[PDB]
């Protein structure tokens, strides 16, 4: 089946710094969906090819890169990626914020 691969599941990121979370997958942008979320809150919503953004460059390489800037204590929490090109799978990731 279609499955998501993560390089790691726990990020430890300094306050005020930047962080790039990754959800890799095997590889049409129009067909591809990518989602990033937090508990009862949505960061990204990507269906029709369009301080937090995505790297559309990596999508050609089967990689969903969530780039956040100026990390804040409330960016701390569990993130969840969901992606699909036909088949679909989801991964969960934890982020903690240092000082």
């Amino acid at each position, epitope marked *: *089946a*279609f499955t998501v691969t993560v390089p790691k599941d726990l990020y430890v990121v300094e306050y005020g710094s930047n962080m790039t979370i990754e959800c890799k997958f095997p590889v*049409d942008l*129009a*067909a591809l*969906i990518v*989602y*990033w*979320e*937090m*508990e*009862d*809150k*949505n*960061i990204i*919503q990507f*269906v029709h090819g369009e301080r937090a953004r995505l790297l559309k460059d990596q999508l050609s390489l089967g990689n969903a890169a969530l780039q956040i800037t100026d990390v804040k204590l409330q960016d701390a929490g569990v993130y*969840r990626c*969901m992606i*699909s*090109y*036909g*088949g*679909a*799978d*989801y991964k*969960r990731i934890t982020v903690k914020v240092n000082a």
Partner: antibody
Framework: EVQLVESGGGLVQPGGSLRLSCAAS????????IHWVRQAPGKGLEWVAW????????YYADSVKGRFTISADTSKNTAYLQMNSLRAEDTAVYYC???????????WGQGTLVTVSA | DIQMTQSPSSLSASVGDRVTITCRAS??????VAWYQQKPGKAPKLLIY???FLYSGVPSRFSGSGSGTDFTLTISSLQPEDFATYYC?????????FGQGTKVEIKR
């Protein structure tokens, strides 16, 4: 015993509104992906919306966008579909349905009939 | 969106013979299609996913094949309880779209 029990079907007047419930169990709902597929009597199937309950990230059909709003409660563990400004065209049986990840929608709801008429 | 097209729209076949329900797509998909079985008053039940893979607990007589535009659900030995309306469905492009149906009456 994965079950998606729905409710809220019945008579509505055009312009009126209706809230449909889709209560889930037998699987992790936070990690699930819930859709909605309607079917007027005699006609085929029509996808209308989906949601990711973990974040509540939604996506609607051009037919229903700006009217139907799907929400979810990962705690109480049930989805919702607030249909507003209804029309006779929207008269159909609405099915709740969770996504089979490898493909398709595996587990469906028992379906409820929403009737739009004065 | 994307159109799915089942042929025939209706069919009558006796018990024991091979049915063959075609479903074509307006856009050159690849492999991302399912097959369901909606019988009257009840919700559709999944049969095939990803064109050529059988779902858990579905009878072996139901088959799947096709890649791109053209696929087909195939029952090897039809049987009274197989009376239903069958659907195809593509799920790589979204909105996810269905066919129109393919009612199968049993010929007795």
């Amino acid at each position: 015993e994965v079950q998606l029990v729905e409710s809220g079907g019945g008579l509505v007047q055009p312009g009126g509104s209706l809230r449909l419930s889709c209560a889930a169990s037998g699987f992790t709902f936070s990690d699930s992906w819930i859709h909605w597929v309607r079917q007027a009597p005699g006609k085929g199937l029509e996808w209308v919306a989906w949601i990711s309950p973990y974040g509540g990230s939604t996506y609607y059909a051009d037919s229903v966008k700006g009217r139907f709003t799907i929400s979810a409660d990962t705690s109480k563990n049930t989805a919702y579909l607030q249909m507003n400004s209804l029309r006779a065209e929207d008269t159909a049986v609405y099915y709740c349905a969770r996504r089979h990840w490898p493909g398709g929608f595996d587990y469906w709801g028992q379906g409820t009939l929403v009737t739009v008429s004065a | 969106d994307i159109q799915m097209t089942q042929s025939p729209s209706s069919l009558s076949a006796s018990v024991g013979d091979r049915v063959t329900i075609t479903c074509r797509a307006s856009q050159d998909v690849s492999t991302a299609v399912a097959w369901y079985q909606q019988k009257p008053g009840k919700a559709p039940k999944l049969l095939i996913y990803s064109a050529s893979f059988l779902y858990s607990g579905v009878p072996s007589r139901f088959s799947g094949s096709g890649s791109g535009t053209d696929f087909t659900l195939t029952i090897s030995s039809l049987q009274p309880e197989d009376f239903a309306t069958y659907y195809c469905q593509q799920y790589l492009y979204h909105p996810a779209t269905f066919g129109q149906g393919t009612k199968v009456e049993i010929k007795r």
